[PDB]
Design a protein around this ligand. Structure first.
Ligand SMILES: NC(=O)c1ccc(S(=O)(=O)N(Cc2ccccc2)[C@H]2CNC[C@@H]2N(Cc2ccccc2)S(=O)(=O)c2ccc(C(N)=O)cc2)cc1
Ligand SMILES: [Cl-]
Ligand SMILES: [Cl-]
Lengths: 99, 99
């Protein structure tokens, strides 16, 4: 698809058997989602932006489906105010910026 | 152009006659630059990042070039982790997300 930026580029995703709304965010190095359970190992990380930092759990090799595409990547889980899909997974679906 | 996301989408901008590096951020609603001088009067604005909301300075109808494409719009000034070019100017230069 070609997605306009007149509005926030929100997509639905499936992860953990769960459906979630998320922002396609080229500014985010990694995908960050609100508190949820995920399988496997993880490690603690601090991520930050305007307003400061939050602590997240970093899970790797997580299966996610996005716009009918299945991708594998890192998911940061923690108290974010906005779920975003970061570059780490946008590359896997072949997403590019164009003007 | 077409910009992939394996690396941060950093581009050169020109504002106030000076060159600066900035991140193309489709997660940012607005355009937020590091502390700098801009002409005219400003207005207060609160923007929300991952660690919370903060006040920044809002300047309207400011000329700014993004990768050589000329724009004129709202530029916010404040303690942003990096210069970000948000949807208000990305739409202006005709930028979309594609996959
Ligand atoms: N309103 C506006 O214009 C606005 C809002 C908010 C900001 S921000 O400063 O917060 N900012 C830019 C940013 C921050 C840090 C590095 C490079 C660029 C966010 C916008 N897109 C990416 C950022 N994030 C997603 C987000 C947060 C809030 C609203 C919408 C989207 S995030 O959750 O901070 C995050 C941080 C870091 C990582 C990581 N390390 O992977 C992942 C995620 C700027 C502008
Ligand atoms: Cl103020
Ligand atoms: Cl604008």
């Amino acid at each position: 698809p070609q997605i306009t930026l007149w509005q926030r580029p929100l997509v639905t995703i499936k992860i953990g058997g769960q459906l979630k709304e998320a922002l396609l965010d080229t500014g985010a190095d990694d995908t960050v989602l609100e508190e949820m359970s995920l399988p496997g190992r993880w490690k603690p990380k601090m991520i930050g932006g305007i307003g400061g930092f939050i602590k997240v759990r970093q899970y790797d090799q997580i299966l996610i489906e996005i716009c009918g595409h299945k991708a594998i990547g890192t998911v940061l889980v923690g108290p974010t105010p906005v779920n975003v899909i970061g570059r780490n997974l946008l590359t896997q679906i072949g997403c590019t910026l164009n003007f």
